[PDB]
Every structure is written in C-alpha cells, then in structure tokens.
C-alpha cells in the first residue's frame, strides 16, 4: 500500500505545516502537525478542558463506531519548546492520504499547554520518530508509520516541505519526479529515539565548505535550524547589522540586509538553503528588526535540522531494519 497527502503551512512564515488526517468511523478530519521529532499521535478532543480549546477541530471518540478505549492508558508529553499536554487513549482507524491503519493509538488530550490553545490551526500532532519515545503508559504504543510499515510497498516515508507553499508527505514509495539529481543516503542512530544523523559540514553563501561533523536530528516539528554557536556565529557574521539579542532570544537582523544561502553536507552531497528561507520577519508588528531562521542550539543539548533545512530538500525517512536518511536537492 501507499499514501500521499498534501501538507500546508499554517501561516506566511512557514512556522509549521498541517496535514489532514481521517480519524474514526465516520471519518473525522483533523489537521495535524506531522512531527519527525516525536512519537505520539495526540489530538484536541471532546475531552479537552473547554477553556483550553480555541478554534481547533476536535476528535469525539463517542461518535466513532470504531473507537475503543485503551483501558488504563494515559499519556503525558513535554516538547523542547516548553509545550505540553496529557490525557487518555483510544484505538481507532486512522487514514493519511489513502493509507489506512486500524487500531492506531489516538491520544485524546484532556489538558494542553497554552501554546497549543493559542494556535487555532493545529488540531494535534502525528509523531513520526521512533516508537521508543512514545509516552503511553503502561503499554507503549506504536507510531502511525510503525503500524503501517509492513503493509507499505516499501518501508519509507518522505517529506517534501514547501517554501511559502504546500508540500507533500508520501508513505511507502519514493516519487522520483519530486527531486533533482540523486538521493544521498546517510547513517542514522536511533539511540535517542530520533532520526539522528551526522552532517559532513557547511558553507555560508559562496564561501568555502568547512568539513566538520555536525550531529543532529531531522525534525519536521521544529521550525528553525539550530546549530552549534560557532557555526551560527560564522553565518550571521556575513549579514550586515545582525546581532544576537538576549531580549529577543536569538539572532536578529535588519530586513534591508541580504541573507546568504547556507549549505549543509550530506556525505559528499550538498543541500543549499536559499537566503530567503532564513528570514522569519519582524520580531513584532512594524519592527524593522527581523528574526533569523538559523539559531544556536547551545543549551538545547542537540542540533536540530528543522523545517528551514528540510524544506530545501526531498527527504527520505527509511525505516528499513537499519534505518537511514536520504537527502536530495529539488
């Protein structure tokens, strides 16, 4: 089997992408944030504290004839950005772009962090990291991809995120028309539960490539590119007027400035992030100071290849027995 669904940015800055997901019988369609940095499928629901719902579409298990309470099961998660949520668990039918999993754990939110309430366009998350990170207790649950894997024509999914435009998630096949050149594959460590790999280095604009190992995660659920402070400093040094602002919480720059591209290495191959992708606009409405899309990972504890980097490539998440990652230009 295969599936294919369009993913759409939630706003003009590509802060995140939402993908429609059918849950239950009859189908309830929710717009979920596909997150390769986590492993819970959780949704706003009829069970969510009313004061914590503000515009989101909810899942109502009682209206689904295929929903079954997973008795005794609870879940609770906190994300790298200080967000969180918690609740109970049903199993139900979940379909993504034509691909159907029966018995998928659907985690029903009883409580969500303010940040989720405040984002009316995201109805929940669909985690695509490794199932070892799943928070359901006492019995850990599998991700949508893990459940679908054996049925898929090939045990892969691909992320093809757009710049200021929609993109595509595919399951079970590689669309050879979606990228240029070849796909370079690189090794993955699952030891932290992430799609963790090692970039071979970077260049800033037309600068010479610096060969150096950068360990990080491919995370569709994170907006920006977070890299070591040395790297980030080398980038912003090439932008006139840029500075790191503690009050703002990162590098900012005047929008009159031209942003250089940023190249990262995948084995011997090279992915170029155009400068325009690194502009995240005014820090506040009307400000002349713009927020940068490349920021320091210092004190995150891990480097994150977020949407800023991934949207510059066609990315293969290969769930073969030994997982790997593939990157192609497009």
XYZ file of C-alpha atoms in Angstrom:
330
model
C 0.000 0.000 0.000
C 0.910 3.661 -0.189
C -0.380 7.017 0.979
C 0.138 10.603 -0.159
C -1.088 13.768 1.493
C -0.539 17.461 0.984
C 0.987 19.401 3.862
C 0.244 23.161 4.109
C 1.972 25.958 6.034
C -0.148 27.375 8.859
C 0.963 30.933 8.209
C 3.003 33.183 5.901
C 6.298 32.381 7.667
C 6.039 28.573 7.457
C 6.070 28.383 11.280
C 4.627 24.869 10.904
C 2.844 22.595 8.437
C -0.558 20.878 8.828
C -1.671 17.714 7.082
C -5.270 16.394 7.039
C -5.806 13.080 8.861
C -9.001 10.995 8.913
C -9.806 9.509 12.327
C -12.633 7.179 13.126
C -15.842 5.965 11.539
C -17.362 8.011 10.006
C -14.203 9.912 9.322
C -13.396 12.914 11.486
C -10.828 15.049 9.680
C -8.265 16.851 11.815
C -5.303 18.903 10.648
C -2.244 17.520 12.371
C 1.361 18.587 12.684
C 3.489 15.731 11.337
C 6.447 15.661 13.688
C 9.522 13.519 12.977
C 10.897 14.684 16.358
C 8.262 12.920 18.470
C 6.252 9.767 18.606
C 2.766 10.478 19.952
C -0.382 10.909 17.829
C -2.426 13.225 20.034
C -5.490 15.335 19.299
C -7.753 18.027 20.654
C -10.917 16.206 21.650
C -14.313 16.318 23.278
C -12.364 15.520 26.452
C -10.129 18.590 26.307
C -10.718 21.166 29.045
C -13.147 23.614 27.411
C -11.195 26.720 28.416
C -8.171 25.237 26.598
C -9.934 24.845 23.242
C -10.000 27.943 20.968
C -10.862 27.224 17.359
C -9.359 23.767 16.936
C -11.281 20.930 15.356
C -11.854 18.181 17.926
C -11.984 14.385 17.865
C -15.093 12.966 19.504
C -14.430 9.248 20.272
C -18.065 8.656 21.253
C -19.197 9.481 17.693
C -16.816 6.945 16.152
C -18.094 3.387 15.866
C -14.554 2.002 15.560
C -13.123 3.820 18.631
C -12.234 1.663 21.634
C -10.909 2.951 24.951
C -7.412 1.658 25.682
C -8.251 0.866 29.279
C -5.875 2.148 31.918
C -3.733 4.046 29.404
C -2.600 7.618 29.916
C -0.088 9.848 28.166
C 1.831 12.995 29.063
C 4.382 14.822 27.000
C 6.560 17.924 27.148
C 8.192 19.337 23.991
C 11.572 21.048 23.513
C 9.818 24.433 23.306
C 8.198 24.191 26.754
C 4.870 22.996 25.348
C 2.996 20.029 26.839
C -0.257 18.078 27.075
C -1.799 14.955 28.566
C -4.836 12.700 28.541
C -6.175 9.219 27.865
C -6.061 6.891 24.880
C -8.366 5.267 22.331
C -7.566 2.949 19.465
C -9.260 3.838 16.190
C -8.937 3.831 12.415
C -6.552 6.470 11.070
C -6.009 7.258 7.402
C -3.459 9.556 5.822
C -3.813 10.296 2.147
C -5.344 6.939 1.236
C -3.282 4.830 3.673
C -5.270 3.277 6.490
C -4.132 1.877 9.827
C -6.629 0.085 12.030
C -6.062 0.001 15.791
C -3.910 3.138 15.856
C -3.407 4.630 19.300
C -5.113 8.033 19.217
C -4.148 10.023 22.293
C -7.004 12.190 23.497
C -5.985 15.423 25.180
C -7.607 16.261 28.500
C -5.119 19.110 29.015
C -2.942 21.144 26.633
C -0.327 23.885 27.109
C -1.330 27.480 26.351
C 0.772 27.456 23.205
C -1.410 24.775 21.669
C -4.622 26.568 22.654
C -3.282 29.740 21.071
C -2.663 28.058 17.728
C -6.131 27.578 16.235
C -4.745 25.935 13.078
C -3.151 22.851 14.704
C -5.605 20.157 15.897
C -2.898 17.808 17.190
C 0.426 16.134 16.382
C 1.248 12.946 14.483
C 4.613 11.697 15.633
C 6.994 10.053 13.182
C 10.095 9.493 15.305
C 10.769 6.036 16.721
C 8.151 4.377 18.850
C 10.589 4.091 21.752
C 9.795 7.764 22.535
C 6.045 7.132 22.778
C 4.697 8.315 26.148
C 1.722 5.997 26.567
C 1.789 4.153 29.889
C 1.693 1.365 30.987
C 1.875 -0.050 27.454
C 3.933 1.978 24.981
C 2.147 2.487 21.664
C 3.460 2.491 18.091
C 3.523 5.389 15.671
C 1.343 5.559 12.572
C 4.379 4.742 10.418
C 5.439 1.821 12.570
C 1.925 0.350 12.362
C 1.751 0.892 8.556
C 5.357 -0.263 7.751
C 4.774 -3.922 6.989
C 1.877 -3.115 4.650
C 3.753 -0.437 2.743
C 5.188 -1.260 -0.657
C 8.476 -0.012 0.790
C 9.096 0.811 4.480
C 9.745 4.533 3.987
C 8.048 7.864 4.166
C 9.240 11.070 2.543
C 8.956 14.736 3.486
C 8.816 17.359 0.760
C 8.068 20.613 2.519
C 7.387 23.748 0.543
C 8.778 27.264 0.924
C 5.819 29.556 1.375
C 3.806 26.843 -0.350
C 2.271 23.403 0.170
C 4.289 20.233 0.029
C 3.832 16.513 0.330
C 4.237 13.597 2.726
C 4.385 10.209 0.986
C 4.229 6.780 2.588
C 5.513 3.604 1.040
C 7.155 4.963 -2.098
C 9.686 7.413 -3.436
C 8.333 9.882 -6.049
C 11.249 10.100 -8.467
C 9.684 13.191 -10.118
C 9.882 15.171 -6.873
C 13.639 15.796 -6.767
C 16.650 16.563 -8.959
C 19.860 14.553 -9.149
C 20.230 11.604 -6.824
C 19.317 10.870 -3.244
C 22.315 10.622 -0.927
C 21.725 8.317 1.996
C 23.416 8.716 5.344
C 23.514 6.664 8.559
C 21.024 7.078 11.404
C 21.378 6.451 15.112
C 18.140 5.577 16.859
C 19.745 5.514 20.284
C 17.914 8.709 21.377
C 14.718 7.748 19.515
C 15.265 10.387 16.825
C 16.150 10.410 13.141
C 19.674 11.378 14.212
C 22.453 11.671 11.643
C 25.763 13.440 11.070
C 26.160 16.225 8.567
C 29.606 16.458 6.959
C 29.859 20.256 7.203
C 28.690 23.638 5.979
C 29.297 26.669 3.804
C 27.998 30.241 4.187
C 26.933 31.840 0.906
C 29.611 31.396 -1.753
C 32.136 30.607 0.970
C 34.366 27.549 1.032
C 32.910 24.390 2.529
C 34.045 23.676 6.076
C 34.395 19.939 6.625
C 33.272 19.192 10.146
C 30.917 16.644 11.735
C 27.589 18.005 12.936
C 25.393 15.540 14.760
C 21.706 16.441 14.745
C 18.115 15.363 14.168
C 15.836 15.685 11.167
C 12.777 17.226 12.795
C 9.748 18.322 10.767
C 8.190 19.522 14.019
C 10.730 22.277 14.636
C 10.533 25.471 12.618
C 14.134 26.641 12.533
C 17.663 25.368 12.008
C 19.529 25.014 15.309
C 23.282 24.501 15.026
C 26.395 24.942 17.205
C 27.194 28.500 18.260
C 30.426 28.550 16.219
C 28.552 27.714 13.022
C 25.731 30.149 13.691
C 28.188 32.941 14.510
C 30.032 32.291 11.245
C 26.715 32.644 9.370
C 25.419 35.841 10.933
C 28.856 37.442 10.692
C 28.147 37.643 6.953
C 24.926 39.648 7.450
C 25.449 43.357 7.967
C 23.739 44.673 11.077
C 22.981 41.264 12.509
C 23.403 40.657 16.204
C 22.407 38.165 18.872
C 19.764 39.719 21.102
C 19.162 38.257 24.531
C 15.935 40.218 24.969
C 14.616 38.735 21.745
C 16.189 35.321 22.295
C 18.390 34.939 19.268
C 19.942 36.444 16.198
C 18.073 39.297 14.562
C 18.895 41.386 11.519
C 17.663 44.389 9.532
C 15.380 43.297 6.731
C 17.164 45.732 4.404
C 20.035 43.212 4.622
C 20.576 40.448 2.051
C 20.764 36.953 3.551
C 23.381 34.497 2.253
C 22.473 30.912 1.489
C 23.537 28.185 3.896
C 24.846 24.869 2.647
C 24.960 21.706 4.737
C 26.671 18.476 3.816
C 25.141 15.054 3.388
C 28.066 12.736 2.807
C 29.733 14.130 -0.295
C 26.482 15.827 -1.396
C 25.340 19.360 -0.613
C 21.971 20.892 0.233
C 21.621 24.610 -0.335
C 19.192 26.611 1.822
C 18.468 29.843 -0.044
C 18.916 33.011 1.979
C 15.227 33.837 1.692
C 14.351 30.681 3.712
C 16.221 32.094 6.727
C 14.035 35.234 7.030
C 11.292 34.925 9.645
C 10.184 38.518 9.551
C 9.716 41.314 12.042
C 10.155 40.424 15.733
C 6.990 42.430 16.374
C 4.493 44.058 14.059
C 6.035 47.102 12.435
C 9.548 46.461 13.711
C 12.452 46.939 11.385
C 14.292 44.126 13.146
C 13.812 40.646 11.601
C 14.192 37.247 13.286
C 16.714 34.809 11.855
C 15.972 31.245 10.868
C 19.372 29.901 11.863
C 19.863 29.932 15.641
C 22.234 28.460 18.240
C 21.475 25.026 19.653
C 23.602 25.797 22.707
C 21.668 24.657 25.720
C 19.153 22.685 23.664
C 21.571 19.799 24.017
C 21.096 18.686 20.436
C 21.387 20.169 16.947
C 18.051 20.300 15.072
C 17.663 20.230 11.317
C 14.202 21.784 11.395
C 11.910 22.947 8.583
C 14.326 25.706 7.454
C 16.785 22.990 6.407
C 14.422 20.158 5.451
C 12.236 22.302 3.179
C 15.319 22.834 0.987
C 15.428 19.083 0.266
C 13.475 15.989 -0.625
C 13.953 13.856 2.455
C 13.616 10.094 2.759
C 12.954 8.600 6.158
C 13.965 4.999 5.509
C 12.565 2.587 8.087
C 14.438 -0.434 6.820
C 15.726 -2.808 9.506
C 18.683 -0.494 9.711
C 17.159 2.937 9.276
C 18.788 5.601 7.135
C 18.078 9.132 5.892
C 18.185 10.252 2.262
C 18.523 13.828 1.052
C 18.057 15.147 -2.477
C 18.022 18.655 -3.912
C 14.771 19.655 -5.597
